């Protein structure tokens, strides 16, 4: 119980009226953001690899490991800082607004954040209440004011509130010189329809009166005075302790299922890299245990290498193997993912099918990091008023039908009343004449003892002992509060678990009379289910912000309720019907493109590095690179970079028109299907097989005196060049075989990558370069191309490597 | 209203090929009918190559060359006896081969100064640190520096055909035209400081394992210094620990006589190169060439095998499709 003095006059110390929704300040932004970014395993590993390349050893420059890491870190920091600065601007708009305080018999113009608990606040018509106020008096003689609470429950209907009867006569300067009172009220809580308090109006008769206070006397922050000229109230709860602030949660970091799969793949490949390095180091020191294996007469060490401590040399050799094989974790993949996420998001904003003539606006992209999440939705939590209705929206029922045909569950979370919400659900055809409604409301339940009986009955004798379309669930806010506040101190007989069990096999769930935090709580409950369903919430009001921030991807509607939902959402669309195109076509395409990009990046880098690992068994495990340093540098920059980027931005494995007309195709990629264990193992074993084929085909080709008609001999650089040529052609042709949607851009990048590989090989190996310290590749490529047997071997190895893919193509397209 | 362009509306004209069993099945027959004859051709071409390999390491006591493993007199000579059962008809190529020699070791591969080997005046007097501990000797730079240069193979191999009167007929060997044209003529160059080579290497010293300096490798001025072809052939490091290096060319005669007639031959060996300290072996290889190079059955066998597998799988799929 908190005690509030009406005019801060004798007849505690609370927070101020300032609201905060940002997470950074100016001074701590860089430390906090860098600490959060480098707490991630990928960034930490990239930093460690860059440091090792700088300090110990590297086959290429440390620049090619430091610059991409800096780029990724800087891009992420800029995005997060801009979003937090937008939150700062919104907080500054909410604060700094003009409020009027009756300080000493006079109206004092102050700032909204400067309101104290226990001061008289004057609010005029059409003005939002700056804090939680107890209504003391109005202009009218009946002490009644009308209020709209659209920002709290999403409804435009007027609500009636009553002033304190002993203070209804206090107007003008009579509210300070004739008002000495104290209010005893509860601690702040988010219920939004429950208030317990008592006011003690002291007078000169020494006989103070006591009047109980209820929610009818409380003017909540965010509500608007309507049709009342002027009211007088006293602050009882101030910013971060008002019910609006207590129904706000704040956004946790949102990570896609594709990002989580990227993290898992990175962990697997980190284990692979460490295993390769450890095997190479162990075999190197077993090999060097022969005194002519280490330091033969023709390959002698310097004095420094001989006088280098053995343990330090072992550690350094392990690090050298690590940097030799580090390419199997590509930072170019992260760079390309950032680029593809940024560039591909423009299709949503360009899409003319999202353009609405009434508001002269199309779709809005706030985050480009969740494009692939639009193709993985499992649950849709929709607001009712202004989202499903305008009378429904243009194609609300048809959109719900398409979402059902896509395999999605649609639940309605509304701050509106049960009867109107249920009528809308019948109009939207979420509930049919055949649907049997199970009602967990205040009509069917009057105490917490009957609630458990209802839950048990809907479990064990109605629904589990069964016809999925047979049942629908209706629950109101108070019963949900009972469930969420009375299911503690238990794990097995969890009534929250029983409620979720009832919900999961109902054809639809209606949650009515919701508070803003309760929608987020429902979304969170669904998010914690077994199997980790992906959640989408959509709404048009400021009371949908909490569930929009809570869900995996939040959709704001550009309607008449303002722009708070749109500004806090990941994506914004004018109409609810646009969700069909946003998910079925855009999200499907985004998921398929990025999943293929991730798998292809890992596969092509394993194909790149495995022959280099195999080459250690034929040198002295000496960390000798199989390829030239320029080839190592531009494998991912110039030779195999653009085709996958063009694929991930243009590929339509299924046409957009087909994707829009067939919602059932959404279920093919339903549970992160393209990045599961099966596909991952397929890609990994294909890469391993192809790398083995590369290296050992070249090895068996080199079991001859000459591959030329002039009898001349090739060396280690030609060996590596042949392996690299087969590798580049194989990975490019694998992507080409995977391609189903060939634009002129795709033709250009795919064929020009190979043409540029040949042209660069000729140009780089054409001129004795006067600025490098070695000429190891002067005519290696040109000499290799003079060998007919080398051409034939390259062609045969390319065909052998692509044979499993061709065989899979012919098998999967028969019977 | 948004921009209704084909790129922005994701409706660019595309090809959209279809890959099905019925349209890809004939490739499993075309590939077979192309690969099998090519594989047979490669296999037949590789079988007609005439090759002989003679090991002269001398590790076994019964070897004409055990007396050269640990010698007393400096120049140890050994002759080995071998027979050519069939005449070598075309151009013949003489190779020496080394086993268990890691020319691909990382410390070995970097032990060179390519600016010095390209005839750069500053690099001639200041060889790179990468070619150490073979960089300086007696307070002078080493003119060819590095381990690769220092370890240059230096055995002398000559061939004699035993005539009808027991008189050995020497087979003429050519030391030119064995290296890559571009690394003889561009990559490897000599210092430009005049015309006499002994003066152009004024402030340098020879490799420590060298007997004579780099300007006494040959009397022919086009094969003398850094452009000596034996030196260049050695300096192009090998890919695998067992390798071959082109040594001499035995050109076919202007007449239609065999280049190496069948009979009895001698192998004059001046044993200078030790390999038994690291368990290596030394071979001499005589071989003929073709369009495919030397003798290697791998390419022909692999082409035949892949073509046959492709054809068999195509037949299996075609029979499956005709079950109806
Ligand atoms: C004819 C038609 C077909 C085409 C023919 C081919 C022609 C050639 C054209 C290709 C060029 C296209 C470029 C596409 C991107 C490829 C590069 C990339 O994406 O690959 C990152 C690369 C390679 O990485 P890797 O995996 O090989 O690992 C490094 C290996 N290791 C770790 C062992 C050292 O690495 C790097 O060199 C970094 C380069 C990438 C950019 C990141 C660096 C930017 C600098 C940072 C500044 C900060 C900016 C922050 C944001 C400011 C706001 C705008
Ligand atoms: C042939 O090559 C061998 C191997 O390099 C040379 O042997 C070295 O000779 C130098 C100089 O006498 C000695 O200091 C080294 O100890 C020798 N090394 C070995 C492993 O024996 C030999 O001198 C060369 N003979 C020539 C040039 O005819
Ligand atoms: C090598 O030189 C002569 C030259 O005819 C050859 O006959 C002999 O067998 C070999 N050894 C020596 C030096 O006697
Ligand atoms: F409009 Al609502 F829940 F905010 F139906």
Residue numbers in the entry:
A (entry chain A): 19 to 29, 38 to 416, 651 to 726, 743 to 1091
B (entry chain C): 27 to 350
What does the paper say about this structure?
The cryo-EM structure of ATP11C Q79E mutant in the PC-occluded E2-Pi state revealed a PC molecule in a reshaped binding pocket. Due to the Q79E mutation and associated conformational changes in its surrounding residues, including Ser91and Asn352, the binding pocket has additional space to accommodate the bulky choline headgroup. Arrangement of TM helices, especially TM1, TM2, TM4 and TM6 that form the phospholipid-binding pocket, is unchanged between PS-occluded WT and PC-occluded Q79E mutant, suggesting a preserved gating mechanism between them. In contrast, PC, with three methyl groups at its terminus, cannot form hydrogen bonds with surrounding hydrophilic side chains. The nitrogen of the quaternary amine in PC is located more than 4 Å from the carboxyl group of Q79E, suggesting that it does not engage in strong electrostatic interactions. This observation refutes an intuitive hypothesis that the Gln to Glu mutation enhances PC binding due to increased electrostatic interaction, as the nitrogen on the PC quaternary amine is presumed to be positively charged at a neutral pH. A detailed comparison of the WT and Q79E mutant structures revealed that the respective side chain rotamer conformations (i.e., Q79 in WT and E79 in Q79E mutant) are different, each rotating approximately 90° relative to one another. In contrast, the Ser91 side chain in the Q79E mutant faces the opposite direction, and it appears to stabilize its conformation by forming a hydrogen bond with the carboxyl of Q79E (see arrow for the displacement of side chains). Due to the rotation of Q79E relative to Gln79 in WT, Asn352 makes a hydrogen bond with Q79E, thus the side chain conformation of Asn352 also slightly changes compared to that in WT. While the WT binding pocket and PS-occluded structure of the Q79E mutant are ideally shaped to fit the PS head group, the PC-occluded structure of the Q79E mutant shows a slightly widened pocket, particularly due to the changes in Ser91 and Asn352 side chain conformations that directly contact PC head group.
